[model samples]
Target: GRDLYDDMAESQVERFTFQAEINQLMSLIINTFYSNKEVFLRELISNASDALDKIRYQSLTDASVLESKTELEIKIIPDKTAKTLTLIDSGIGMTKTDMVKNLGTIARSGTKNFMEQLQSGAADISMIGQFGVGFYSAYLVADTVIVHSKNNDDEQYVWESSAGGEFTIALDHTEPLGRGTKIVLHMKEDQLDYLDETKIKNLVKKHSEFIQYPISLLTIK
Candidate 1:
C-alpha cells in the first residue's frame, strides 16, 4: 500500500544540483517548447519500457536477475484526492548511483546527443530505443515527481524533484516495491485531468500501444 511511504518522514535527504543541460531542457519542456502536456505519458511509458529491457538482457547469463514470479509488466494508478499518477514497472530497478547518474547528470554524458544523432545521421544504427533527458518531460504536468526503486544488487532508494534545478535522493527504508520502479507524479493543480481513468487509458492506447510490455491503468473502484 502507498501508506508504506509514510515512514520516509524521518529519512535523510541528500540534495544534488541538476546538470546545466538538464536545467535548460527541463525549462524548455515546462515553459516554452511543449504546449501539449500529454506527451509526458509517452516519455514515461517509454522510460519504463527501457528499464525493463535491461533485465531481459542481463537474464541471458545471470539466472539470479529475476524474481520467482517474473512477469514483466507496467501499472498506472491514479489518486484523485492526492492528485498523483503513479507509474510502476516490474523490471531491473536502479541502484543509488543509477538514480543519481542515469536519472541525473548522464545527459551531460551525451546520451541525449547520441540519441539525436542516431535519429537522422544517415546510416544504420546500433542502440535502437532509449530514454534520456526525455524523462524530465514529466515536469510538464507534475509539480513534484517522486520515484521509488529497488535493484537486486542494491537497496531501495527514493528520488524526489520539484524541477527547482535541484533534487534530492535518500534510502527508502520501507522498501515498497520488490524490484523495478514506482514513479509518482503529483500533478499540478491545473493538470488534475491526468488523474482520470478515461484520460490515462486513452493516452496509453494512443501513445503506448506499441510498447512491448503490457501497460495496465488500474481503476480504483
Candidate 2:
C-alpha cells in the first residue's frame, strides 16, 4: 500500500523558522527539566493516548473518522541501526494546517501566553505543555523528531524538527498510516539507553500501563 511515486509527486515542502522566544523556551525546558528527562516518554505516550481517546469519543457521533482505521493501538518501533525510536498510533491525524498550528507554535492561539510564562522567570516541567510545550519533551532523548500523519480530510504530511530555531513540513506521498500519527525520534547519542527494550518497556509499564488502548513495541533489525 506504500507508494513511492505518490510520495515523490507530492513534494511540496514548507519551512518555518521558530520565534526567538520559542528557542529560548526550549533551552529552558532542556536545562531546567534535566532532573526528570525520562518523563518525556510518559508525556509523549500520554499525548498519543489522548489523541486516540479523542477519535474514539468523536466516533460515537461521526462514524467516518474511524472508517480509515478501525484498530486503536500504539506501536513503538526501535531501530538500533538507525538509532531511532518511532511511536505510531491509530488516532486522529493532523493536516498541514494542524501540523503548523500544533508543532510550529504553542497553544491553540496563545503563543503570547506561553511566552509570558517563560518570561516570568519560573517555568517548570509541569508548565511545559500546560501552556503548550509538551511536544518539545522529545528533545530530551532525541536530537531530531519526524512526525508523519494522515488525516481523512487531508493528504499525509511530514513534520521534522531538530528542536532549534526552525522546523519543516512537507507532503508525504507514502501513506504509512491511513489515519493516524507516527513520530520518529532520532536518539541523541547520550540517550541511546532508550534503545533497550527493557528500558522502554519499563517506562511504558510504569507510566502508561493505565492507557485504555493497547500499546505494543517492535525492535527493528
Candidate 3:
C-alpha cells in the first residue's frame, strides 16, 4: 500500500537492433580471428592502450589526473604460485552494468568495417574499440577469468566468467582498484607461455611501442 510505503518511483525499458552482417562480423572476430589464440595477448595490450587513451583524454580536464601515473600504464604481475597473470591498467574502469553489457554481447556496427580495414593493409589496431572482446582474450589463456575494476563513480566490482558463455559480476568486498582495472587470468596448462615475463614484455613493447602508456612486467621472486 502507498506504492511501497508511500515511496514514489518508476522504471524504464528500451530495445535495439543489430544488422545480420554485424552478428556475422562479431562471430568472425571472436571465432575466426581469435582462434589462432596468441592473438589474445596482442588484443589485450591493444585494449590497454585504448584504456590509456581514455585516461589521457580525461586528464585534460583534471591535471592531477594521471599525473603521478605515466599516462595510464599497463602492468602484468605473474604469480607462479597462484598460476595467474594479473593485467592491470590505470584507465577508465567499468561499473557493474558496463561489465554486463560489455562482457556479454557484441557491440555496435563497426566490426565489418574494422575487419575490412584490417584486411586492406591497414592495421586493425585502430579499430579495437569495445574492451569486452579484449576481456574475452583472458579466456584464451585461462579457462576462468576474473575482472576487478573501480570506476570513477562506483564501488569496485569483480566480474567472473568461465569459457562456458556466461559471466557474472559481484561486488568486490575485498579492496578497491584505486582507479582503473585489473584482469586476473588463471592460466590453462597449455597457456603457460603467457606467464613468461620476457615474452609478455616483448609482446607489449612490440605491439604497443607507440602506446601512450608504459607496459611493465612484475615478477615475484
Candidate 4:
C-alpha cells in the first residue's frame, strides 16, 4: 500500500540510536585510532567471522541451523560504479531485537551476553565482541552502512546508519535474504580505492591471516 518503506513498522525506523560511547568510539576510531583506513576491511571480515563462528557452534546442538545454507563462507562484492562494497556471510545473523541490542548499544556485547547466559557449558568456543568496536571501523571508508540480516529465529531486518548520532532498523519484506548477514558499505569518495580488486585481495591476505573459513570476492561489471 506504500512505497519502499512500506513494509517496515513505522515506529521503529526512528527509534534506534547508538549509545554515546559508541558514537564517541566510531568517531575516535576513524579520526584518531585507525592510522590505516585499509584495515576497515579486516575488521569487517573479522566480524563476519565472528558471526560464522557463532552459527557453527550453535549447529553443534541445533540441527536446523544450516537449513538456509550449509557451507559457511564470506562473500565480498564490490561495485565500482555504485561505490559500494558488500560483504555477505552465512552465519549467525541477527533478529530485529538483536540488532538494536548489539549494534545500537555498543557497551552491551552479544558475545559477552552469550557468555554470561552459559551457566554450565565447556567455554571453549571461538567468539567475538571482546572490544566491541570492530564493526564501526567501516566508517573509516564508508559514508553510510546498510546491513541486511536474517536470523534462523526471525524474519529479515535491515539496519542503516551514517555513523553520526543515530541509526535505523526495520523489518525487511522487500526480498528474501539468506540465513546470515550482509553488510553493504557506501564508500566515501576518498576511500574508493577500496573498490580496487588488487587492494581488497591483498588486504584480505595481509590482515585475515588466520581465519579458517573461506573468503570469496566478486566485482560487478
Candidate 5:
C-alpha cells in the first residue's frame, strides 16, 4: 500500500504525473468528497462478507489451508470499557505486503482500479467491496486503528495508524487474524455514543436486518 505512493513523495518527482493525479483524487475524496459518512459501516459489513467468502473459496481449493471449523461469520464486538469496537471476519487473511499496499495508498489498488473503471464508464459501484476504501472509514470514527490479521501466505502482523500522516507495521505479539482479521477502532470521544448497545443494535438492524445473517446485541443486562 505504502509503496504505491513511494515514488510520488520524492522531492524531484515531476509535478504533472499520473501519481499526482491519483493523489489529487484521494485528497478530493478525504476532503470535500463522500458526504455520506454513516455508509461506512454498511460498507464494512459487506466487506466482512467478502472476506468470509474468500476463506470459503480457499477451503474449496485446498482443504488443509483452514484450521478452524467455525462457519464463516462476521462479528461486531464492541468494548465499551476500552472505548473500542472490533469488526471481525472469518475471511481470507492478507499478507503484510497486502496490508501495506491496500492501506497505504490508492493508485493501482483494487479500489482505485474500480474507481477508475467507474469514472471511465467501464463499471458500476453497484456491487459491494468493488472498492476497498471501506476500511479507511475507520478514520471517520476513531483516532487509532489496530488491524490484526493472519494470512495463509504470511506471518501474523499488526498494523497501527492514527491517520496523523503516516502509519507503522510490525509483527504482532498477538496473532493478527489468529483465524481471521479483527479491525479494532479506538473511538473518538464524540463517537463514544456508538458504544451503546441499543444504538449498535438499532444500527445493525436498520441496515442489515434483511442481511440473511444473524445480527444481535451482546450486552450486559
Candidate 6:
C-alpha cells in the first residue's frame, strides 16, 4: 500500500497562498452558487479543451511541438481502490512559471497574456477561456485536487490544493508526461457517486457533449 511518506520522501514541495480574489472566489463557488455539482465536470472538460486548442495552434507553426504524441484526447480514470478519479489530457502542459501564473491566481488565466498577444495579431478570441476561476470548481466535489503537468520547456511538476487559501507546488521525479496534464481528484465519500459509470456518462452527455476533444471514461468492473 502507498503511504503518505512515499509522497514526501520523493519530492521537494513548496507552499503559497492564493490571491485575495481567488480566495474570495472559492468561497462563492463552494458556498453560494454552482448549485449543480456536475458543473465541476463541465468546467474541467472546458479547461482541458482550451489546453488542447493552445497546443494545436502552436503545433501549426512547429510540427515538432507535438513531441511524438499527435493524438489529442482527454481521459477520465476512476480508481475505487484509491478513492480517486484522474482526468488526463494530451495537450499543452504548464511549466513551473505557468503553474504559478495560472493555477496560483483566480480570475486571471495564465493564458491572459498569450491571448492578448494573439488578439493583437487579429487571431480568434471568441473561444478563449474566460475567468480562469473555473478550475477551483473541483472543490465542489473533491476534498483534494492534485495537478501533474509537464510542459516542453520544463520538467514535470505537481500542483496540489485542498481548496483553501494555500496550495503546494512540487517537482515530480518518478514518472512524467511528455506533454499535457493529469488532474487527480480525491473524491469525498458522499461524492464518490461520480465514479459510477452510468452516473459519469450521464453527466458528460448532459453537460459536455459539445466539448471539442474526445472524452473517454475508465471504470472498474
- Considering every candidate listed, which one attains the maximal TM-score? 2
How does each model score on lDDT? 0.73, 0.75, 0.62, 0.73, 0.62, 0.73
Model 5, runs deviating above 4 Å: 1-36, 106-132, 209-217
lDDT of 3 by residue, 1-221 (tens): 00100006432322223334444443444444333466566666666666666767777888676543444678878887899988888887777766665555545445556556656747443234442234444555676778888777677888776644445677786666677888888888877876777876776567776676777888778
TM-score list, all predictions: 0.82, 0.84, 0.69, 0.80, 0.71, 0.81
Off-target runs (Cα >4 Å) in candidate 2 are 1-10, 30-33, 106-127
Model 1 poorest ten-residue lDDT run = 123-132
| Cα lDDT tens digits for candidate 4, 30-120 | 4543335765777788778878888898899987889887889999998998899999988888888788877766463333443343223
lDDT per residue as tens, model 5, 70-178: 5567778778889887887767767787777666643445556755774676854333244544455566667788888777778777777765455667777664355
Tell how far residue 9 is off in model 3, in angstroms.
31
- Global Cα lDDT for candidate 3: 0.62
Please name the candidate that would achieve the greatest lDDT relative to the true structure: 2
What pairs collide in candidate 6? none
For model 1, how does the per-residue alpha-carbon lDDT over 113-209 read when each residue is reduced to its tens digit?
5445534663112222233345766787888899899988788999998886988999997646888899999898888987778888898889786
List the lowest-lDDT window of 10 residues for candidate 4.
Answer: 1-10
Query: Lowest-scoring 10 consecutive residues by lDDT in candidate 6?
Result: 1-10
Instruction: Please identify model 1 stretches exceeding 4 Å from their true place.
Output: 1-10, 109-131
Error of 3 at 66 (Å): 5.4
In angstroms, give how far residue 171 of model 3 lies from its true place.
Answer: 0.8
In model 4, pairs of residues that clash are none
lDDT by residue (tens digit), candidate 2, 1-221: 11110113536778887666667666655555365577678767777887787778889999878888999899888788899988898888888888887675533333456656656856545455565456777887788899999978898899998866789999886656988899999998888888898888887788787899898888665
Better of 2 and 3 by TM-score: 2
Task: After the best TM-score superposition of candidate 4, give how far the Cα of residue 183 lies from its true spot, in angstroms.
Answer: 0.3
